[model samples]
Target: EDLRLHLLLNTSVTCNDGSPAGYYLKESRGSRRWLLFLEGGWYCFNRENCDSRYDTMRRLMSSRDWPRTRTGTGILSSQPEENPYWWNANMVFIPYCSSDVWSGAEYAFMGALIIQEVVRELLGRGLSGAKVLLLAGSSAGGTGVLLNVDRVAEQLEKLGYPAIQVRGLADSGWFLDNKQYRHTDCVDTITCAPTEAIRRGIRYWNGVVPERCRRQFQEGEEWNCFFGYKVYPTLRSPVFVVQWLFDEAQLTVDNVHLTGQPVQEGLRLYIQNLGRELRHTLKDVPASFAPACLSHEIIIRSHWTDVQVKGTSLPRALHCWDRSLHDSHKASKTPLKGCPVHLVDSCPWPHCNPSCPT
Candidate 1:
């Protein structure tokens, strides 16, 4: 009941369209842990996509009143039974309005800048010098975390706060390179290559992708934001990522050819490819809890308690994960071998509740 939300004035920050944007903070008097959660919605590359994206959605649009996200859900929840060790950590939920994850150009983007400013505000509220800091997000927000977490830590270190442990937990933000769209059974759905949309996104938003990501590519492939693997090599901070082998949203994108099965082979190939890349890219990540399922996003779900792979839930794993950073002996053996890679029988992973929110 003590949590309250506030918006920084229009004059306070720059938005591509001069819209209102803000964050919600709930302080924990006795805890040094903190979570900066970036909220996610689907993105659009064109101006029209932006229009419908904002207009149809009430919370992330450039509006005067934004909805309040009260409780920290899933891994960020404050209940000991749910999040365990992180139950009462200081929490900040960032609402998405800019179509850009946090980067933009001209008069059209500034999501990244807003995050920096918000971090400054959080610092004033005592986030600086925290014993543990976790930057986490879901869906597009998960991509945001991967894209900006390095910079966040870089800033904190510049501000003399680098000694503190900083980590990231990305939920279902395993954005794949859809431009690899090739011959498929569903031709009508193949109107545009998914990579093309991403290309427009980077250009339209003036995305400032990290240099590490660019290093992964040759001369002509700089703006490959669609592939989450392209960004992982750039992350120096310890990060934890969870993704379903069978992502529903991804299937919808490539579903033009899906047929004759609950989950088609082509779709399974795509999902497996994603999982394969993640395994290689995130091999050094502190923890990975991928489960073979039909669901999309977790963490915020009311059904979170029911979601887990190999008996290890997100909260339970994250609780131990954060604790390991504090363990002196655990530091040298940082990337734990026992880290999970949960999967079910290849194609027919259990069908999750169809009603689970994407």
Candidate 2:
């Protein structure tokens, strides 16, 4: 059994269209490690958007046609040749259907509840004995990991299994709430500003923000937590951020879409500014691998290992992060010797690094 869809029949979780929720599981033979991955897709802000998405991207709203068995890729890959590090870990692929950035629990779209119930179910199926649980996701799913990592750890503790070390690996999910490259007052269009979209999406999805993050914002400003830079500081668990210096999704929000043609002078400046801003925001993160590349998501790509930051690839940095967590003591002032865990490309411009994938 490679990766098979396991329906959440005994739980209350359901997709946006009221379809039974499920996850794809590929358990290891003996490894006690686990990687629970959340799938990512951009979300709808209002009823019209959800309706249109339901008609077009039905898979994101309903699991009615999901293949019975699927194959894993990148970090979730079972082949040791591709995913050398965690190939033997139990992998759980959780689909995104709520269109809420995995924060909603209203109506039939129970993204938050789905995560909770799924982990509870997995606990009964060997996850309770796990040594490490890595909650990971890409794009919006990456934001989900940020929003829920602490909650998952709390849930495990409440279940009397507090020994498990839970960590988060977020890929291309460090979204910024910066000024758009061009100004726009429109709030309902597909290209509306990020803040406007989040403001509307919060209401539509009845989004759930972390209590710690929520406390920082005013009553109506809870939607700020939807952005990675806003919610990341409140997370208590150890987490590693995997981001591109020029994230494509972030560029879309900034109104800097890319084509094969050379970038215009105005947009070129914007791109450079974007990299600098991203670098500034990521400075305080304890563990991260940020390559100077123009990409959306890399961790799930075929050439994920090729993208390097400061001469260290993502897998290498992640391994360093794991070691630091396991060995470093606050009392020890000596720095660990190995590959650098906190990596970010210092060079400006997209694809400045030769390791960037074409």
Candidate 3:
């Protein structure tokens, strides 16, 4: 069979309400496998200028040329009419921004709706049995993967369809209990106070802002409560968490908020405790049970792209994802830390040799 490539750019589809939803689709001829890539927050659906982002991803995925796999891209917008869905029989890629610093609930809900739309679209395209893969990096994107697990399952259940195989790749996930971090006062390069951003987030979630003012409701007591109540319980799928040793956004700052100590010490304790909790939660479940039912399956990686170095010492590079990438790249020459395995341990530094295990 001859290999062919199809690049579908800026394709707009009108929703039921007559709103225009836009997306980009790339199709590969040889392989039956399909890969869908979703972008993170504060981004438009422009794939040309951001070719480097796709280039790095292609390198990671082991695709040699421009026409690698059948891929689709879309934007999460406030306008619901402009939303489209992915329901392909091959693998679907949903990339999201983990650092949802400025995004609010509307953005979150829109993302959810977009996913739902994709599922419907896939079904409509006669690909009902397609396997679904939820992939994201950073904070909010990671959380989106986690929170939507149950929603996806329920949607499948409602349609009387078989549950789609859902797997997630969360790089540097910020899974802290937001309430604990809400009151803490910490300093970082971007801001001096911890609660400053949390406060704004609280207001935004409550819909006090002008745009979503009509949707405003009572303010919740704590920010983490929202995740604990509305988000966490809905997650019931296998999740692969890639944490760097020094992901300041998640581990460093998150630990300080949880334990009031410097990021390193707090992170060590946090991982240990988190592991123990998972063990306890999954103690009785069958060994084959999905990770969400058992607790989070965490993989430690060396620093990849977004790791920020605080100092010259080990503590400087203590974030999880950075450590994961750093360690993976170092051990690539040998079989020390297996790639894409559960419960990996490696240093989160850049270009470090013989990466140390935590």
Candidate 4:
């Protein structure tokens, strides 16, 4: 019913703003496989936001506030009847306190660094190797996983003995650099403000935006580049994505004008435009799942049980990918690729029904 949160006290693990950070882990006896889940929350883009975020996440809380307990949901549950395939795997929940998606800080806000330390600790604790390593997150954590997936792969690969495998799943993190709207008018779809806030975010967090990544866009889109889909085409790893065409949480003004929401004929144009674009981007992807729901994170049982894309469960879809993305006989372990993935988008009936509602 609950899990233990390990306070990373090695003197090496700290947040971007220099407060302690921690994670909760549940180990298993099944295999040496691992699922590193980055916790999701909105980000603290600048010093003003960072200080408040740090105090609330770290200093202001009691030991009672430290523990994050969970039950069998999408991926966290260990019950076989519920989780089935990955019931007994080593799972770690990396809490989101850095507000950085595990990235920067003059290179030291260091969520990624803390991740490295955690993996080594897991290795020391009966974890001899990794059969498959999935890096996933929701919201901000989702963005973090996409941005840092390659780095995590490189770090784990340095382990050498186990020859670890890695893939990333970014949940509800799909962001479009929509040029159709003016900056403050839901321009980026999710952000209620302009991109300048992120420029400050990058500088304040020491956020890393590789020059090559910057080059992928027009000379001016650097800050906008932080959007996951914007730069994932350049990632060395295959990343899965889940987003609602009518994403409730991402709703913004003129965006409702981005061909749509709440209207059927228009929603098609909206979903189609975004999906076709994503399909093009995932030209090299392993299978993925995107459902039609107004909810934010689908990893919870409340939604996971009912959420699906073309009649497939989230667990089943991921299992298919585990084989195709990680198994050497079926696929390669690094820089993931395979046969054309069966794009799992939400279906119309018993699916994303806009024509009928509760």
Query: lDDT: which candidate is best?
Result: 2
TM-score, cand. 4: 0.78
Each prediction's TM-score against the native?
Answer: 0.83, 0.95, 0.44, 0.78
Worst 10 residues of 1 by lDDT: 341-350
Error of 1 at 297 (Å): 1.1
| Predicted structure 1: lDDT | 0.66
- Candidates 1 and 2 compared by lDDT, better number: 2
- Give the alpha carbon lDDT tens digit for every residue of 1-358 in model 1: 4345667644556544576667888888698888888887766676767665556664465646655657666665777676665778888888777777665433357778777877877777888758877888888788788877887888899988876677888888875554343544322223345566566677777776666776777754656744666677667876778777556656555543445467556655665675455445555544676665666788766566666555566666766666765564444854444544432223333344232233
Candidate 4 residue pairs in clash (backbone atoms < 3 Å) = 16-109
Candidate 2: Cα lDDT at 25: 92
The order by descending lDDT is 2, 1, 4, 3
Better model by TM-score, 1 or 3? 1
Error of 4 at 196 (Å): 3.5
**Candidate 3's residue-wise lDDT over 125-205, tens digit each?**
434554443433334445455445455556777887653444444433433433232234433312223334444444543
Which residue pairs in candidate 2 have backbone atoms (N, alpha carbon, C) closer than 3 angstroms, thus clashing? none
- lDDT over C-alpha atoms for residue 333 of model 3: 56
Between prediction 3 and prediction 4, which has the larger TM-score?
Answer: 4
Off by over 4 Å in 2: 185-189, 328-339
Per-residue lDDT over 1-358 for candidate 4, one digit per residue giving the tens place of the 0 to 100 score: 5556787767666765455677787777667778878776666665545555556665321223554665535677677766767778777777776666566633246666677777777777655556677888877677777777887777767777436777787886765645323346322323444255556666666676544567777765567567765677778766777655444445442244434335666545665565455445444445556554445566534345445555566776777677665655434354235432454454432135432112
C-alpha lDDT score of every prediction, in listed order: 0.66, 0.84, 0.34, 0.61
Per-residue lDDT tens digits for candidate 2, residues 236-334, read 888899999888888888777677798889888888888999889889875878888887887777788777776677777887787667576568564
Best by TM-score: 2
